Write a protein that binds this ligand. Structure first.
Ligand SMILES: [Zn+2]
Ligand SMILES: [Zn+2]
Length: 180
């Protein structure tokens, strides 16, 4: 059960494009579902991930402009419950305790966050925190030299493996972690 985690590739009124290294590798990857943190470029992007997975899971962020969306959602893949949201509501942004209380509040095992534009996967009390980072290296007050990034995760029941993909200076890097 291998799912794509990505998002956060736009900000209000700023230029960005879509790498086809991620697409060309992910187009054939045989991904059943997709987990998105949000801030889509628009209707031109939210279908690209329908070429990737038949089921796409989207939520709202600071500069989302579509309709028919929820700002939070919870998912059960394998034996893993995971909570999806953008994190633009979490104040302060990226604070270690706020994510924790949100994670006891949502009764998830894993909480995806966005809006920091970094990859940052930190595990605590058996709880996993995954941030896709800026999928196209979008500009944020947090980062001015950002890298495009995303994360794939295969959940075989209780065993979960993560793949940290970063397009660093023309080189594609994968940093894989094995969890059980
Ligand atoms: Zn963002
Ligand atoms: Zn954002």
């Amino acid at each position: 059960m291998l799912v794509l985690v990505i998002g956060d590739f736009h900000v209000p009124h700023r230029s960005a494009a879509i790498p086809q290294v991620f697409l060309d590798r992910l187009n054939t990857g045989r991904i059943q579902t997709v987990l998105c943190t949000g801030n889509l470029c628009g209707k031109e992007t939210y279908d690209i991930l329908r070429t990737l997975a038949r089921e796409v899971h989207v939520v709202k962020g600071d500069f989302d402009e579509m309709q028919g969306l929820n700002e939070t959602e919870v998912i059960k893949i394998g034996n893993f419950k995971i909570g999806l949201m953008h994190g633009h509501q979490v104040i302060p942004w990226g604070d270690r305790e706020a994510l924790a209380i949100y994670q006891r509040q949502l009764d998830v095992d894993i909480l995806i966050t966005g809006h920091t534009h970094k990859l940052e996967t930190k595990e605590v009390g058996g709880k996993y925190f995954l941030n896709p980072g800026s999928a196209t290296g979008a500009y944020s007050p947090l980062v001015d030299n950002p890298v495009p990034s995303f994360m794939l995760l295969e959940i075989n029941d209780s065993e979960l493996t993560i793949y940290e993909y970063t397009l660093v200076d023309g080189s594609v890097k994968c940093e894989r972690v094995d969890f059980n």
